[PDB]
Amino acid sequence: SCPQNVNISGGTFTLSHGWAPGSLLTYSCPQGLYPSPASRLCKSSGQWQTPKAVCKPVRCPAPVSFENGIYTPRLGSYPVGGNVSFECEDGFILRGSPVRQCRPNGMWDGETAVCDNGAGHCPNPGISLGAVRTGFRFGHGDKVRYRCSSNLVLTGSSERECQGNGVWSGTEPICRQPYSYDFPEDVA
């Protein structure tokens, strides 16, 4: 039987099959916090295995770069509820959201801010917050590549091609906190 010394600071947990081997423990934290660790599995040995628990603040990813413009405030990551504001230098027009708020799930609201000089066959595809991009030409057939920085998790296209219609192929890559992958759907 697995031991009961498994309380989480600031949060709660559920057991799938009580304290028995095979039982999955799932931690939950209040909105805007995440459990570290997120779960434990009760082993046949009678000891827990993660695939002292604490609830830690969610943060949204900071820009790694923001070209031909400035953002404020300038931080290495952002608190839940915090806003970041974007402004472009002369000769560039801001596309996307000039003000964005960090949501409790670690994602920014609105859409990626981009300072675009309007010179490409395709628009400047921008650089989503936490991503690093390769490529500087936005003509028909040109390609950009992306990765997510640090331990951030990528969704969407890591390579995009500027198509004949002036649309980048695929979908904009987005970088998420790795602990967001412990969040369920449909939570109160």
Method used to obtain the model: X-ray
What is the location of CATH 2.10.70.10 in the chain?
Answer: 1-57, 58-117, 118-177
Spatial separation of the C-alpha atoms in residues 144 and 160, rounded to whole Å? 5
Neighbours of 31 (CB within 10 A): 11
Angstrom distance (rounded) from CA 94 to CA 72: 15
Plot region of 166 (φ>0 → left; ψ -120 to 50 → alpha; else → beta): left
Q: Which of 175, 171, 183 has the alpha carbon at shortest distance from 147?
A: 175
CB 183 within 8 A of CB 105: yes
Beta bridge mates, 34: 56
Which token pair is 49?
Answer: 């295995």
Q: How far is CA 151 from CA 72, 147, 158, 177, 180, in A?
A: 24, 11, 16, 7, 12
For the range 94-102, what are the long-range contacts, defined as Cβ-Cβ under 8 Å and sequence gap of 24 or more?
A: 94/69, 95/123, 95/124, 95/126, 96/126, 102/59, 102/60, 102/78
How many Å is the maximal CA-CA distance in the chain? 67
- The tokens for 16 are 């799938």
Angle at 150 between CA 148 and CA 152, to 5 degrees: 50
Give 85's strand partners.
Answer: 72, 99
C-alpha 107 chain-centroid distance: 5
Looking at residue 86, its amino acid is F
- Alpha-carbon distance of 184 to 188, in angstroms, equals 10
- What CATH number labels 1-57? 2.10.70.10
Resolution (A): 1.8
Please tell me the CATH code under which domain 58-117 is placed: 2.10.70.10
| Burial class, 35, CB count within 10 angstroms (exposed 0-12 / middle 13-18 / buried 19+) | buried
Q: Which CATH code is given to the segment(s) 118-177? A: 2.10.70.10
143-148 vs 159-161, strand pairing mode: antiparallel
In whole angstroms, give the CA distance from residue 162 to residue 176: 25
| CB neighbour list of residue 62: distance below 8 Å, 6 or more residues apart | 75, 76, 77, 78, 129, 130
Q: What are phi and psi of 97, to 5 degrees?
A: -85, 115
